[PDB]
Design a protein around this nucleic acid. Structure first.
Lengths: 328, 114, 122, 112, 110, 111
RNA sequence: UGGCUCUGCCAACGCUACGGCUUGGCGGGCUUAGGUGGUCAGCCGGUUCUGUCCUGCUUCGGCGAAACGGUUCGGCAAAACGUCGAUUACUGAAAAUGGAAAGGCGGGGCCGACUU
RNA sequence: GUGCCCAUCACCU
RNA sequence: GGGGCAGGCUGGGA
């Protein structure tokens, strides 16, 4: 491989790729009005979508914008199955040419790196280096602040294909601040966007012990003054370059626990977030006093996987004391 | 009766394409074949009865037949034993049935709009 | 591109078929495994398994609840065929694991059908 | 009438059944389907003669229309054409004659 | 009553079913359709007797008429002879017997 | 009264090995007997999902048609006759289902 | 898929329009994705009881202070990968859906040890 | 609504 | 006493 990338809409619109995009788009959504209305003439619908992409006549359908409010209110704009399919067709050829350049410590929406690989890299990189302190930051409204202009200085430093560059600009117009949260194309463009601060930590600033998950950035250190300087340098950059205000940040010692990704992470141990605990607690509590104790076993087995890492037992005892049911 | 004659003539292209596919299905998938043939050739009677009357329910039963034909393409594409309707053949057939669905759709609207 | 839109778009018939296609996808391979003898029973099972789709689809493209109970009767008949393939067929046809697995898939289609019947009855 | 229609449909069968029997094995299933449409249409006429309700009189008409499609199918969709365009003309005229009795029958019942 | 017609129609079957088995494989579809019309008309009589609708007794008449068609069709069906003209005459007598019982049954209901 | 089906499931369990034995020779009769034996479940199921005496009478007619099949398959000749023991020992199973059907029809008729 | 409207032979329930049909044997031909969950990007508090733990430097501002996942330890970092160089040079009127490299930064990579 | 990771279920290599 | 972690307990967004 070596730069350029100047004929991607040929691969984007390859039948074997749109079938992958169709499979990807339908994976898990096979109970939904979108798939069931599409599944009817599926291979025919892929043909009028291929011929709409391959012609340069694809127009992204309007987001239906509701607001899920669960952990906090977020304006989640969903997309038609045809549009999520086109995003999947783009992020099959366009994603692995951005996700390749992402430094190894970015653990968001990438294959084989995830929520856990992050909490493990932070714990690990906490044991080695024997970090005395740690800077944790977070970007205010990350998706509703991505410049959608300076983003298209990175999505146009890699795509080079004058047609794919126009399909990315039909999916995400290159106008003003605001990447739609609730879009595959968006998770990618945000990890790429946040990857700018990765290069300013790793390349400039020469910070080698760090981790980013989308907007959350841990930077384990040894002095709490260099880490504060690194943040100031990171904040000044992400503000004057990327238009991202830092909502919360903390240069705490590795003693306060690194609230990273649903785990408070010490060098030695690593609990969970109290919110996840209480959410699951109340979710089970409701499920019991609603009338489901067989799907609870499916959930319990699920959450026993999310908690097998954490040093829990601060819920399973609690559950067993509230209802007596044999958790573990 | 323009739409009934048109819808059949357009459906004849589905038959013209799918009957050779339907005849090639191995006797193993024999029941699936005989049911697919009765669904393919039997859709004509659904169109005929729809034209023979004016009830929009008859044009909906024609839509159900076309939906059942679309299922058969999906099903015969799956059947992984002897194997049948290759994915290309489901693609080409879905295009043909869509034009039959298009004329039936305009037909249903003509009846619903008196 | 507006995906090709069939007339009478019923989510219950689309969902029930997609979920019954899983029953077929499971039962059809083991319907085809029924030996040479027991072929009439297989043909009849296959016409009950594959023919249930048409029951659902005609029920969708109809304003008649009568079609919906006929789909329920067919699902009931499919449940008998599991009892027959296991507990009346000679070699084995359907192992009790397969019966339990199919009874779960058919129950999913039964749950959708029950809600569908209820939604229309109201 | 009720046996007047069948006697004229017998002529359709007497003509089409030899054609149906000439259809090669390859198209055995189409033949069995065609034969069940050809020979089974008698039952449609007969059941309409007994109980005279116009219901099965239109079902007999739909069967005749389905038989007319089969003529188109056997000589236009069956790739080894198992019927000649002449035969789709005389048999159509045979079907047209039984269609005329069916038409008059429909009119006589729907007088009321 | 359904028992009398069936017992008399069992005689039709007992005569026609060996003859219906002898129709050549070439005339296979006509055979299997004639066999499904022979055996199968019992069900028309049985359904007519186990219930009461008149229509059921007419559908039994239609089946009997369809069986009479099959005799006249199988007689001189093609070069592979299906049913000898004597067999049609013999069967038509048996079917006439069940036709007479059906007719009296229809009359007694009406 | 889903005891009918469970009790008829033993009629099947008996009359199926002796309907999956009817040779090719008597193939149409076998296909029709199997559709009458195995298809009687649907008659009972449809009767159970409505309670309409009608569907109950059609289940009675099917059992009567199954009784015809016994009488017909007995006189089918050759080694493939349903043995007279089987015609009695299945008329017993069918009578059990007939007695439940009779009580069922009476329960609905005398509401 | 208990096929074949398919043949040769041989039978024998039978049926024959006397040709055969049928039927039985007997050869031959034809016949990895998936589902369902959950995770996380992805709450704001209030409050003290409990448990624990820290309570120094000082410039006087503040800085503070609270048994392993192969998450292993080293060694390397040539190559490949990534990144910048670069949609640059160059080619060509034009990069026009051609197109580098010398480098620079990396660790993502590599090598063994031990364990997985 | 989005993906990543995970759990279970189905299923044969 | 003040902190820091950890566990409850509760109120709202829901």
């Amino acid at each position: 491989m070596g730069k350029r990338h100047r004929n991607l809409i040929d691969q984007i619109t390859t039948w074997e790729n749109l079938l992958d995009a169709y499979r990807k788009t339908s994976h898990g959504k096979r109970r939904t009005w979108g798939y069931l209305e599409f599944k009817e003439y599926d291979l025919a619908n892929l043909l009028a979508l291929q011929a709409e992409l391959k012609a340069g006549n694809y127009e992204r359908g309007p987001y239906r914008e509701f607001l899920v409010y669960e952990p906090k209110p977020r304006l989640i704009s969903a997309l038609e199955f045809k549009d999520r399919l086109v995003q999947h067709a783009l992020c099959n050829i366009v994603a692995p040419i951005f996700e390749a350049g992402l430094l190894p410590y970015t653990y968001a929406c990438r294959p084989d790196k995830g929520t856990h690989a992050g909490v493990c890299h932070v714990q690990a990189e906490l044991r080695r280096t024997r970090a005395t302190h740690f800077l944790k930051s977070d970007f205010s409204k990350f998706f509703p602040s991505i410049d959608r202009a300076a983003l298209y200085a990175m999505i146009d430093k890699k795509i080079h294909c004058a047609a794919t560059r126009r399909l990315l600009r039909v999916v995400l117009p290159d106008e003003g601040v605001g990447i739609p949260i609730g879009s595959l194309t968006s998770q990618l463009f945000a990890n790429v966007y946040g990857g700018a601060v990765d290069r300013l930590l790793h390349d400039e600033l020469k910070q080698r012990h760090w981790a980013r998950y989308m907007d959350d950035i841990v930077v384990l250190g040894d002095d709490p003054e260099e880490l504060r300087a690194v943040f100031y340098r990171l904040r000044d950059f992400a503000s004057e370059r990327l238009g991202l205000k830092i909502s919360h940040w903390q240069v705490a010692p590795v003693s306060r626990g690194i609230n990273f990704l649903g785990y408070r992470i010490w060098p030695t141990h690593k609990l969970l977030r109290k919110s996840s605990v209480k959410r699951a607690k109340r979710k089970v509590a409701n499920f019991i006093k609603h009338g489901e104790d067989e799907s609870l076993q499916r959930f319990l087995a699920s959450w026993s996987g999310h908690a097998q890492w954490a040093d829990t037992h601060n819920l399973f005892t609690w559950m067993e004391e509230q209802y007596g049911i044999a958790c573990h | 009766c323009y739409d009934q004659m048109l819808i059949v003539e357009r459906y004849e292209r589905v038959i013209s394409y799918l009957y050779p596919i339907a005849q090639s299905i191995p006797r193993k998938h024999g029941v699936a074949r005989e049911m697919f043939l009765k669904c393919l050739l039997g859709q004509v009677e659904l169109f005929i009865v729809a034209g023979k009357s004016n009830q929009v329910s008859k044009l909906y039963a024609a839509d159900a037949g076309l939906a059942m034909l679309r299922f058969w393409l999906r099903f015969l594409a799956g059947i992984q034993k002897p194997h049948a309707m290759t994915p290309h053949q489901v693609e080409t057939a879905q295009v043909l049935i869509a034009e039959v669905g298009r004329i039936l759709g305009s037909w249903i609207a003509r009846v619903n709009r008196k």
